[PDB]
């Protein structure tokens, strides 16, 4: 509590000298956090008389107090009505122990001695007050240790900082307790009225101190670090803090500015593969607390700065991270309302569209240069302000590069979540102001979306080829059928929404001269018919695809609205009628196949 300024006023210190001179005192972890001293491997339980003996028991790396509670409940045959009326303690130091914390942070390996343990009969309220005050004291020493480490790496010589922070990162890698002990709280004590805002305030301070320490640890190191899988483990503390105290404004401003700083520093990793470790937790926290505008404002500012730093790979990784949590009301995958909604993603993208003013003043904790510019010249100072049609253009380009891959299927799920919500909110805004330039931008926007849909259907011919101990077979039929039913769902919702609305908008445009602008062309209709025909070519052998909503919505909602008064569109219909002919001929000529059809 005074060494926090003494180490700021003492020069001549490194990482290794204190470790080399501390090992002589057998108390390395009792001063600094990064001391890698292993703990005990056995422990002794003490009795009260000659009826019982002190017994030695092994300690693993995952041992906790509850297993010892079960041990003394089973051995001494304690009734479970008196479970909370009994506690365990040490005779020498007179210390009560928290239930849900690990033994290994408390007992380092004494030289061939094991610390004692006694099963004691105590009143419960005095014991829980003792537990609360000793862990209040204990994590105040952790907070003190973190203060020592933050004040330690501030005024180091400017030649020695790189090897210091690099070997610091290396000894953080060797620790098995990181980051368990760096992010976990005490949860059986936060609900009591006698540990209400004390443990919260110190936990807020401890998390803020850990963020400061990590931010110093990330900076300093070179920008061309061989970042393996280890970054995700380090990033997990940043996720966990936002898990524990999301509405606390201090942790939010610090979290936003620290992730902005570590996205400006490691610019190589955070241009290719870096945003996949921080965005799931940010989207979950954004989706849950929708009745909390401060958390919303902080996350939209952080995501807007993410886009201003990296334009297109951030949007791609964002769509790759919002995808496995999206649930939509489909009749194949019955999406429940227990995750990221489609609206949550779309209003987040709408906040990414417009500008976000600053209310919380997060920018002055960013150590980089201001204002932020694009860190790569491939996108430069071009006016790439983020629209929403270009997100569809990116999804088209990534599904078009390889339509049999996994990113294509994933982004098809992304597209069937996004484009009904975009057409919906487009309908609200064009039914909100009712103006002639609004009609002009609605016709132009529908034309550009239609252009992107023609571009989507022009490059999926690899999906028109039909199919070729059963779990991999179900996986193969799954990855067969998902992008196809995704295309059918997208195209039939597009047609049945915007066609009559195109006639309605053409009536209310102020100019009814342009009518029947021919959204889909003949090759798109024939392509939809060949995909649906390839889907129907598997139909009688697996019984789950007859009731699929893409195919059924195409059959019952897209075939009767397709015009056939011209005969240029007709070969789509002859192939569809031919496939239904042969299916029902086969269902009629085989009674065994008829005995298993719905």
């Amino acid at each position: 509590t005074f060494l926090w300024e003494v180490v700021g006023y003492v020069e001549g210190l490194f990482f290794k000298d204190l470790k080399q001179t501390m090992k002589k005192e057998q108390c390395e972890v009792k001063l600094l956090v990064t001391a890698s001293m292993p703990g005990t491997k056995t422990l002794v339980v003490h009795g009260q008389n000659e009826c019982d003996i002190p017994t030695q028991l092994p300690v693993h790396e995952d041992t906790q107090f509850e297993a010892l509670l079960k041990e003394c409940l089973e051995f001494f045959n304690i009734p479970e009505s008196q479970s909370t009326h009994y506690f365990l303690m040490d005779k020498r130091w007179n210390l009560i122990h928290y239930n849900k914390t690990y033994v290994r942070d408390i007992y380092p390996f004494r030289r061939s001695v094991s610390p004692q343990l006694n099963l004691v009969h105590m009143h419960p309220e005095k014991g829980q007050e003792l537990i609360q005050k000793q862990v209040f004291t204990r994590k105040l020493e952790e907070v003190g240790r973190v203060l020592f480490l933050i004040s330690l790496t501030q005024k180091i010589p400017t030649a020695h900082k790189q090897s210091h922070v690099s070997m610091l990162q290396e000894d953080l890698l060797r620790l098995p307790s990181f980051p368990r002990s760096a992010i976990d709280a005490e949860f059986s004590l936060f609900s009591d009225p006698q540990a209400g805002k004390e443990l919260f305030g110190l936990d807020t301070l401890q998390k803020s101190l850990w963020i400061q320490l990590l931010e110093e640890m990330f900076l300093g190191m070179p920008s061309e670090f061989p970042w393996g899988d280890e970054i995700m483990l380090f990033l997990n503390v940043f996720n966990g803090a936002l898990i524990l105290h999301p509405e606390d404004s201090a942790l939010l401003r610090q979290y936003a500015a620290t992730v902005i700083n570590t996205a400006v520093h490691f610019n190589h990793l955070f241009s290719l593969s870096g945003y996949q470790w921080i965005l799931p937790t940010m989207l979950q926290v954004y989706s849950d607390y929708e009745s909390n505008p401060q958390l919303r404002q902080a996350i939209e500012f952080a995501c807007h700065q993410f886009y201003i730093l990296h334009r297109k790979p951030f949007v791609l990784q964002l769509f790759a991270s919002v995808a496995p949590l999206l649930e939509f009301p489909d009749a194949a995958n019955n999406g429940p309302s227990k995750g990221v909604s489609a609206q949550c993603l779309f209003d987040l993208l709408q906040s990414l569209e417009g500008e976000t003013t600053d209310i919380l003043d997060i920018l002055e904790l960013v150590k980089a240069e201001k204002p932020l510019k694009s860190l790569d010249f491939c996108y430069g100072n071009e006016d790439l302000t983020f629209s929403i049609s270009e997100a569809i253009k990116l999804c088209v380009t990534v599904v078009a590069y390889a339509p049999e891959s996994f990113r294509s299927l994933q982004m098809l799920m992304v597209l069937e979540a996004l484009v009904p919500c975009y057409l919906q909110k487009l309908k609200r805004q064009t039914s909100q102001v009712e103006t002639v330039p609004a009609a002009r931008e609605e016709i132009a926007a529908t034309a550009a979306l239609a252009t992107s849909l023609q571009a989507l259907l022009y490059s999926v011919e690899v999906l028109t080829r039909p199919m070729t101990e059963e779990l991999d077979e179900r996986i193969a039929r799954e990855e067969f059928r998902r992008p196809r039913e995704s295309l059918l769902n997208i195209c039939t919702e597009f047609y049945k929404h915007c066609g009559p609305r195109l006639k309605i908008l053409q009536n209310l445009a102020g100019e009814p001269r342009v009518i029947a602008l021919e959204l889909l062309d003949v090759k798109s209709h024939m392509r939809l018919a060949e995909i649906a025909h390839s889907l129907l070519k598997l139909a009688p052998y697996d019984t789950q695809t007859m009731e699929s909503r893409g195919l059924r919505r195409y059959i019952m909602e897209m075939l009767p609205i397709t015009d056939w008064t011209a005969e240029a569109v007709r070969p789509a219909l002859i192939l569809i009628l031919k496939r239904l002919d042969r299916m029902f001929n086969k269902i009629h000529k085989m009674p065994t196949l008829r005995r298993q059809v719905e």
Binding site: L140, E198, G201, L202, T204, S208, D248, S291, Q294, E364
Partner: protein, 427 residues
Amino acid sequence: ITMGLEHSLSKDIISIINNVFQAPWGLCQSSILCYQLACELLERLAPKFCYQQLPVTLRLIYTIFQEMAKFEEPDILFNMLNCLKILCLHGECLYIARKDHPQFLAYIQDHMLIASLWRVVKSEFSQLSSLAVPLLLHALSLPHGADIFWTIINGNFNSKDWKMRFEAVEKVAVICRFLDIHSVTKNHLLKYSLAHAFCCFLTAVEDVNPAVATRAGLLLDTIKRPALQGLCLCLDFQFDTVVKDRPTILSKLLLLHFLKQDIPALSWEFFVNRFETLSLEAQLHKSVRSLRDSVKEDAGIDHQTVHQLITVLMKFMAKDESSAESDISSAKAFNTVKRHLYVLLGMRLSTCFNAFIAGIAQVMDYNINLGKHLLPLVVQVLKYCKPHIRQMWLKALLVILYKYPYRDCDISKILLHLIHITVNTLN
């Protein structure tokens, strides 16, 4: 279309909303949705005691305050706060209460408004605070309110239980970190109340329980620098006006420079404002209480306060570099500091000279650039017009020449007189 926020039809709608508000529930999401819908109508509306002549808006605020202390979920609390803002400023009920409702305004402030807002200011759900702070700043901008807040922070901070001290330092931290700069510069006792809050906040850094000490130190880190600048400006205003409390404030300010030095807690414009303020306190020949419980005339005493400021000034130039020549700003400020440091310090029965000798040795030991820059003016004033101060005198003349190229003409000659003083003031 405009329909009138004060009309008899709109107050009849308000009477409907009151007797909705006075009927409680005794599912829960039904009460969230009912109150939010009513609140949306309120947004759309404005862009036993003798209650039968009272207008219904203050009785709505009354039953809001009554049902404030019942629940613990911040969603309904948040909604109530939104409604409160709509009625306090857009509804102008406190504005008409301070216009022509003083007694009932005393009733409102004395037991409901301040204690409830002090209850809802928390450090774990910090959106209630973001709503609560301009309402509480509207409350403290009025008479009778600062005394209640003064007694609240006195009974919270000076308590014999340390948890009350704990909760007081977290709450005054949450008021401090949600403040603005120019929004406070019109009211006097608002600045006085925020100054007393800030000085108790700084006083808790050195408290006798270590938990409150470390919490105030770490929670001082999490304050945005414009709010700390505005707090320092309020404290400097209270130093400017109030006379009898200048002992304590300087100690607090030294702690401020010792802890948060990136903000200019002390700068040269600060010293020139205090130079003109001690000039108006010296060359010219209230009603508020003293904040000394926050911790607990032309010849000597004002000059002793000047001396104390000189000691703080020597500590400042010993501590930091403060390169006023690196920028074109603060050139006239530092220049004014040296000029008037010459004029008012240049009459051998004062307490300033020995402290200047006591300070300038550590100044020359720690600073070099401004130290060389200020040396010749130190030696011009050494004998311009005593055992231990002789010891510091020779220590001063020991560190005049240790690393310093003094070598000029008509000035070095006086060092000959100095060794003459080795046989003059000894003889």
